[PDB]
């Protein structure tokens, strides 16, 4: 009600608006170190 507000609010994405008001898909990569033995990195470059 009055001064009791639902905390979330909608974007309401419209195709008409400008680039600054356009939707954008954001993907955030994260890395730290050392929490386990390392498992992931790039492929080995093997030749003949």
């Amino acid at each position, epitope marked *: *009600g*009055f001064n*009791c507000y*639902f905390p*979330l609010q*909608s974007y309401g994405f419209q195709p008409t608006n400008g680039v600054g008001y356009q939707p954008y898909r954001v993907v955030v990569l994260s890395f730290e170190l050392l929490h386990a033995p390392a498992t992931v990195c790039g492929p080995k470059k093997s030749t003949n």
Partner: antibody, heavy 124, light 112 residues
């Protein structure tokens, strides 16, 4: 901006099924609650059913437990009301109407600020 | 549940004259926060009903200023200062406390 559209509801033989579909255009249909209303020609309204967010919580009025089947699609923003065992006293103006309620003590069957456009179901 | 009463139901009121509309409640609708929980509506013929007054006192969106609700506890009253041909409608009342949303029997306002 915000308005509610209905579809279906007409001449039907009693004791069968019917389909009524409620599609929304301009609100956050995931977050808002949803409610169902029956109104006969010549006497005012009667609540029949209500659902909370994401399905799960479905409620029914006294005469309509089991007779009515309710369902919700959060992807295509459509509200359905699957119909079973129609009776001549179910000839009433059927329409979807939305609720405010998003708080903890807002009681999804409660304060319903908008109402839908409206269609008449004739069970005869 | 809440045994609700709207009386009198058929209201022939001359246009330009004030009209007094009441709805009565069995249980007290005053909550622990001090606010009133009963909502006043109007249904036009063929047009979907509107919220006119929420919580007994305040502006619902688009409602003109001459519509005003009153009351406390059980005895509430809806008043219009001036009635015109756009004020014809059937006046309902709904609560928000218990599980079943109880409506009123509908107060038909008529123009003479």
């Amino acid at each position: 901006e915000v308005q509610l559209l209905e579809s279906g509801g007409g001449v039907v033989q009693p004791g069968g099924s019917l389909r009524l579909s409620c599609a929304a255009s301009g609100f956050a249909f995931t977050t808002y609650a949803m409610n169902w209303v029956r109104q006969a020609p010549g006497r005012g309204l009667e609540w029949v059913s209500a659902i909370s967010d994401g399905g799960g919580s479905a409620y029914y009025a006294d005469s309509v437990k089991g007779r009515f089947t309710i369902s919700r699609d959060n992807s295509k923003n459509t509200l359905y009301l699957q119909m079973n065992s129609l009776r001549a006293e179910d000839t009433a103006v059927y329409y979807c109407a939305k609720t405010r309620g998003r708080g903890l003590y807002d009681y999804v069957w409660g304060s319903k600020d908008y109402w839908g456009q409206g269609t008449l179901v004739t069970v005869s | 549940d809440i045994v609700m009463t709207q009386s009198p139901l058929s209201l022939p009121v001359t246009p330009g004259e004030p009209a007094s509309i009441s709805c009565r409640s069995s249980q007290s609708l005053l909550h622990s926060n001090g606010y009133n929980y009963l909502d006043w509506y109007l249904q036009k013929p063929g047009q979907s009903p509107q919220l006119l007054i929420y919580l007994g006192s305040n502006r619902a969106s688009g409602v003109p200023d001459r519509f005003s609700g009153s009351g406390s506890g059980t005895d509430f009253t809806l008043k219009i200062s001036r009635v015109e041909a756009e004020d014809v409608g059937v006046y309902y009342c709904m609560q928000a406390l218990q599980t079943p949303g109880t409506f009123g029997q509908g107060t038909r306002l008529e123009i003479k």
